[PDB]
Amino acid sequence: VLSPADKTNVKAAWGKVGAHAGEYGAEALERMFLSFPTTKTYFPHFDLSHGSAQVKGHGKKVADALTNAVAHVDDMPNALSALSDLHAHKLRVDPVNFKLLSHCLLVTLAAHLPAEFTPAVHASLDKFLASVSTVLTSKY
Amino acid sequence: VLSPADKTNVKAAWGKVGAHAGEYGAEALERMFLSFPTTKTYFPHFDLSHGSAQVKGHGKKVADALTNAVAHVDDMPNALSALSDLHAHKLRVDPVNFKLLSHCLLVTLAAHLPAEFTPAVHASLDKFLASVSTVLTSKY
Amino acid sequence: VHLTPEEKSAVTALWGKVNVDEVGGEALGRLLVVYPWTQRFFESFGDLSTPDAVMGNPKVKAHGKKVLGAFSDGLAHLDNLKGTFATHVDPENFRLLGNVLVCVLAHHFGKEFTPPVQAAYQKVVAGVANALAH
Amino acid sequence: VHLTPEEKSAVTALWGKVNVDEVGGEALGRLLVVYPWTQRFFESFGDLSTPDAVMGNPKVKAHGKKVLGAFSDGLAHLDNLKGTFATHVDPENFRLLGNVLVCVLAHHFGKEFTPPVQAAYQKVVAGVANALAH
Ligand code: HEM
Ligand code: HEM
Ligand code: HEM
Ligand code: HEM
Ligand SMILES: O=N[O-]
Ligand SMILES: O=N[O-]
Ligand SMILES: O=N[O-]
Ligand SMILES: O=N[O-]
* CA distance linking residue A123 with residue A103, whole number of Å: 12
Contact B6, B124 (CB under 8 A): yes
B-D contacts (CB, under 8 Å)? 20
CA B103 to ligand 3 center in whole angstroms:
26
Q: Measured from the CB, is residue A62 less than 6 Å from ligand 1?
A: yes
Contact B86, C67 (CB under 8 A): no
CA C63 to ligand 3 center in whole angstroms:
7
What are the Cα distances from residue C48, in Å, to C37, C58, C60? 12, 11, 10
* CA distance linking residue A78 with residue C6, whole number of Å: 53
Q: Does A103 touch chain D (CB under 8 A)?
A: yes
Task: Name residue A111's amino acid.
Answer: A
Q: Residue C105's closest CA among C60, C68, C57, C132?
A: C68
Gapped junctions in chain D, after residues (C–N > 2.5 Å): 87, 88
Q: Return the biggest CA–CA distance within chain C.
A: 44
Candidates D36, D89, D93; nearest CB to B92: D36
Contact D122, A36 (CB under 8 A): yes
Helix locations, chain B, DSSP H: 4-17, 21-35, 53-71, 76-79, 81-84, 96-112, 119-136
Q: What is the DSSP string of C56-104?
A: T-HHHHHHHHHHHHHHHHHHTTTT-STTTS-----HHHHHHHHHHHHHH
* CA distance linking residue D110 with residue A27, whole number of Å: 13
HSE, CB side, 13 Å, CA atoms: give it for residue D8: 11
**Residue A136 φ then ψ, to 5°:** -65, -15
Atom of ligand 4 nearest to the CA of D44: 30
| D50 φ/ψ sector (left φ>0, alpha ψ -120 to 50, else beta) | beta
**Residue D35 φ then ψ, to 5°:** -125, 80
* CA distance linking residue B60 with residue B57, whole number of Å: 5
Task: Name residue D47's amino acid.
Answer: D
Tell me the chain D residues in contact with residue B97 when contact means C-beta distances shorter than 8 Å.
90
Q: Does A140 touch chain C (CB under 8 A)?
A: yes
Task: Considering every ligand atom shown, identify the ligand nearest to the alpha carbon of residue C32 and give its number.
Answer: 3
What are the Cα distances from residue B113, in Å, to A8, B18, C109, C119? 49, 11, 11, 20
Packed helices A96-112 and D91-109: angle between N→C axes, nearest 10 degrees:
20
CA D45 to ligand 4 center in whole angstroms:
12
- Give the distance from CA A59 to its chain's centroid: 9
- Burial class from Cβ neighbours inside 10 Å (0-12, 13-18, 19+) for residue A35 reads buried
What are the Cα distances from residue C128, in Å, to A110, C74, C79, D95? 37, 6, 12, 20
Yes or no, beta carbons of B123 and C51 under 8 Å apart:
yes
Residues 6 or more apart whose CB falls under 8 angstroms from that of A2 comprise A10, A73, A124, A127, A128, A131
Q: Return the biggest CA–CA distance within chain D.
A: 44
Per the annotation, does C77 bind a ligand?
no
What are the Cα distances from residue A99, in Å, to A36, D68, D96? 11, 24, 10
Q: ∠ CA D132-C100-C88 to the nearest 5 degrees? A: 60
CA D39 to ligand 6 center in whole angstroms:
20
Packed helices B53-71 and B119-136: angle between N→C axes, nearest 10 degrees:
100
Q: Which chains touch D (3 or more CB pairs under 8 A)?
A: A, B
Q: Measured from the CB, is residue D70 less than 6 Å from ligand 4?
A: yes
Q: CATH for C1-134, among 3.30.1330.60, 1.10.490.10, 3.40.50.300, 1.20.120.1200? A: 1.10.490.10
Packed helices A119-136 and D23-34: angle between N→C axes, nearest 10 degrees:
50
Task: Name residue D56's amino acid.
Answer: G
Q: Measured from the CB, is residue C35 less than 6 Å from ligand 3?
A: no
What are the Cα distances from residue D104, in Å, to A29, C3, D99? 19, 39, 9
Question: Closest residue (by CA) to atom 12 of ligand 4?
Answer: D66
Contact D126, D73 (CB under 8 A): no
Question: Closest residue (by CA) to atom 2 of ligand 7?
Answer: C88
What are the Cα distances from residue D106, in Å, to A61, A79, A108, D115? 24, 31, 8, 10
SS3 B7: helix
* Neighbouring C-beta atoms of residue B10, cutoff 10 Å: 22
Question: Closest residue (by CA) to atom 2 of ligand 5?
Answer: A62
* CA distance linking residue A55 with residue A102, whole number of Å: 17
* CA distance linking residue D23 with residue D29, whole number of Å: 10
Contact B38, D90 (CB under 8 A): yes
User: What resolution, expressed in A, was reported for this entry?
Assistant: 2.1
Question: Closest residue (by CA) to atom 4 of ligand 4?
Answer: D67
Contact A101, A35 (CB under 8 A): no
Atom of ligand 4 nearest to the CA of D43: 30
Interface test with B, best of C30, C107, C108, C114 (most B CBs within 10 A): C107
* CA distance linking residue A97 with residue A1, whole number of Å: 21
* CA distance linking residue A126 with residue D46, whole number of Å: 25
- Burial class from Cβ neighbours inside 10 Å (0-12, 13-18, 19+) for residue A104 reads buried
* CA distance linking residue C73 with residue C118, whole number of Å: 19
Our CA dihedral for B72, B75, B80, B84, rounded to 10 degrees, sits at: 150
* Neighbouring C-beta atoms of residue D107, cutoff 10 Å: 23
Yes or no, beta carbons of A1 and B139 under 8 Å apart:
yes
* CA distance linking residue A29 with residue A45, whole number of Å: 15
Domains of chain B: 1-140 (1.10.490.10)
* CA distance linking residue B105 with residue D91, whole number of Å: 22
| D110 φ/ψ sector (left φ>0, alpha ψ -120 to 50, else beta) | left
Q: Does B45 touch chain D (CB under 8 A)?
A: no
